Symmetry: C6
Subunit: 213 residues, 6 copies
């Protein structure tokens, strides 16, 4: 974590042992590629140096292969960054962004603020990508209410499946509303279909949600 000195100079601080242990238990119960770890790491890594965004991630508990997969995806982000940003006189280098050969004080500098911001972004994209590798194709379509599962529970699973997929907002909204009625059990889809006629199939996320419960 960068510390802003009262003099205005900037020095470094070891990650607060409270925050580190906080992220670890969220990477030990949910996983280091799980969204819960991704959400907590991004909020607390705002002050983290490019050096502390990589070292802490490595220390976090996870399967050895997953760290290979994450650094593998992370290397994919770096090569992409070099291609999108051609070598330039003051342009950052993958090493500068990956905190290579920098003392913590030099990696906590303002010039490494862009570097720390760029680094954290690559890790989140890789984890979303490592997470996508776990997801099989068409998870939402396969999900249904087997054994007449609670309409609430079924919608929770369907929401997880759309959230799993990286489809963009305009298409994320299409899927949630469309799949909820289609994959619903005949008992409540049928009663709602008569209850709200065409409209229930029209909009299903909220109006259909309250009716089935």
């Amino acid at each position: 974590p960068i510390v802003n000195l009262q003099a205005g100079g900037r020095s470094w601080k070891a990650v607060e042992s409270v925050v580190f242990q906080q992220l670890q238990t969220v990477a030990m119960q949910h996983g280091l590629v799980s969204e819960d770890f991704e959400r907590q790491l991004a909020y607390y890594a705002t002050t983290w140096t490019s050096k502390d965004i990589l070292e802490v991630l490595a220390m976090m508990p996870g399967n050895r292969a997953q760290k290979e997969l994450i650094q593998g995806k992370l290397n994919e982000e770096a090569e992409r960054w070099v291609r999108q940003n051609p070598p330039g006189p003051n342009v950052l280098t993958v090493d500068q962004i990956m905190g290579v050969g920098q003392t913590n004080q030099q990696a906590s500098q303002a010039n490494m603020d862009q570097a720390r911001q760029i680094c954290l972004q690559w890790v989140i994209t890789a984890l979303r990508s490592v997470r996508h590798m776990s997801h099989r194709p068409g998870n939402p379509m396969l999900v249904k209410q087997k054994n007449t599962e609670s309409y609430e529970d079924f919608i929770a699973r369907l929401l997880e499946a759309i959230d799993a997929e990286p489809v963009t907002d305009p298409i994320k909204t299409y899927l949630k509303v469309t799949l909820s009625y289609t994959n619903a059990s005949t008992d409540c889809q049928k009663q709602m279909d008569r209850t709200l006629g065409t409209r229930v199939q029209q909009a299903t996320v909220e109006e259909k949600m309250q009716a089935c419960r």
Copy 2:
């Protein structure tokens, strides 16, 4: 959390890991829509930026659908805010209030103090509204002393049922006093009815409370 610098400038701080873990255990035992989480979040979110009122809520443990329901209600609050406050030159935008595209420092500014205040208000209304969706109609009327439940316990349940409903104070008071005698078991309602005659039915919250126990 906004931090007020001695210089008078304002900077940001990651939510204290003590407070975050505090709210989470109250959102993991009672629920993230439960009143206990709503009370603790409001007290500790006074300093929270518009950005930290949304990110922390998302990190808190809850059913996936409930977060959809909360953001669904939260979007209802935003559209209502735009209609009630027409677009204006210095008027806040739903994005400004929802901390969109703002760095933590820029979201911890005084101009975002109104934005953070407006944001927190929407979340509480949604949760009360998400909570109301769980409540069926006429919960207090259905509540009674089945199996001669302790008059204390029965009043506790009845108080919870009025608190559940969003009826206004003048009508919240009507219900508590009225339903306590009506739904009471014959044994103690009858003995009190003879004991205090007309007055016991007149006022039931305190005088009837001590007598039945």
Copy 3:
């Protein structure tokens, strides 16, 4: 908690999460009307704003009816305060004392110091009063050494019973000394009666205490 700024201005702070959790476990094991919670809340609520003396109490775990009983007694304190202190030009209002419509900064002001002091006093009186409602009449007189209970234990129970009652010091002392010999088992009251003759009945709290054990 009010924080006294070095500049001399006064700002507010969310109740330290260490102290809050401390009072809660004493309101979850002993009760929120129990003396143990009352003692810890008064010591730590010295800096608490009128707003933080009410919000934290509400968050503390307790039966729903008990909070009704506490706010019921608290309203009794407020109406009494208005009658004893007639409306005046600079006189505090029940709202000012109950931290109504005040921002935390404005409720942490010196002018609200009297208000915070007055508020805390009402809550303690109500809890003592809520606690008295639980106590049946003449608890000390009924208490005896059934099954020849340890004279120490019996005196502990008798001391609890006098402490329960709100009798004033001059009469609190009368009861402890008087009831200890009268309610004592025949075996040790008789042996002490011969051992110290008239004096043992004269003074019973300390001289009789050591002899029976």
Copy 4:
């Protein structure tokens, strides 16, 4: 706890919740009259105000009668203090020493430093005195090595028994050395008596201690 302001003025602070919980667990496992609580309270009560030396003691977990016994002994200390120090123009009053009718700030003042020092001293004497009441007469003499208890263990119990008694240093030393050989089991007292002849009975605390084991 008094806090020394940088300006040189002195203000008050609620007992650190870390220290309070520390003393409580030592008053919940060993007892509030036990030496372990007495040792920890004295070390941490150096900064405690006369008001915080009494309130925290009351909050600590203990049998109700024991608090009566401690305040009983504490009142014995106060009456003795008045007799030894006759009423004087600037002489402290039992109330001033017992933090009566003083705001925490006024009880954290330098003039209350003597008062806080005098108060803490009375509580320790009472607890030693409350502890003595538990001790029966001649505990060390009765202690022996029943069933050939480890000479180490037997000396531990004997040391506890002399420590229990308030005999002065010149007589505390007499007892430890004298009782260790006398109460020892015949097997090791006899072998040592031949082994070191007259000297072993002469000095028994260290030379006899190593030999029996």
Copy 5:
């Protein structure tokens, strides 16, 4: 831990009890020679004095012989340092680097910053070396998918085996890709060999990883 005084002078601080306990539980579950302890110690030992890099390591829980092995390897590093850096007028001495006969303040000085940096480096090399002693020769080659172990799990074990070996990056990459197909079970190596023909054997770390699962 060195503390940088506002005056610019430098003083010492006892290792934060939060960080110490953090490293110990990682040296009590994984081992004091395990990579997990090595990663956490290096990140938190940035501020540690040469004196605190040795004392804390000794306090950490481990087999007695392992500390002999670590100090044995540590002495190997020191003799090597003397040979590589011949005695010089301002050149550091193994004692200066090993914080011998220095007060904490004098060991927290800027001149001991190089000494603290040099010390920490030796300990990590020894632990990697102590860890290598545990590793038998050719661990990766022996590792295979016995009982058709998950291709993911098998790659995790193989990655651990290459990480175990101190082979340099150019040869670390050769091994991971080469051994994954060779040691794979016939069922998935065969199906992949037909699926991707020559290329699957060409590159096996990522393309073969997703296909077998």
Copy 6:
């Protein structure tokens, strides 16, 4: 703990409740005379006043006799200090060193820095001496590989036995290397004796250590 004021004056602080509890659990699991407690106490007692080096030790959990043995040895250190340092005009007194009749502020002074340094040294020597009393003579020689114990484990026990003895470095090195082969089981001592001939008996700590495992 002494606190160095910004003004340059020095005041006292109650031992951080985090560090105290840290040492206690190491004096409750390993013992208050065990090396683990001795190592942690020395590192954290650098700032401790002469008064806080004695009071905290007494509070730490231990057998009553052991504290007698430790203060017994501590008195041995004091009498030795008086003899080695004859009474002098500015020479420290055992009382000054043992923090007798000094207020914490006066015991936290620079003139008591030598006194605090001298005090801590005596306690460590006594504990090493109290620990030696537990050790019987010739512990390393008696230690062997009974039931063919792991050569690693056997060397761990032998290293503990030499560490137990206070023999000086030149003779500590002689013992470890000499006893490891002599007390080894015939199976691995014999195979090593043929494997490395005369040299294996020559040096046994490292070369023989790797070979037997």
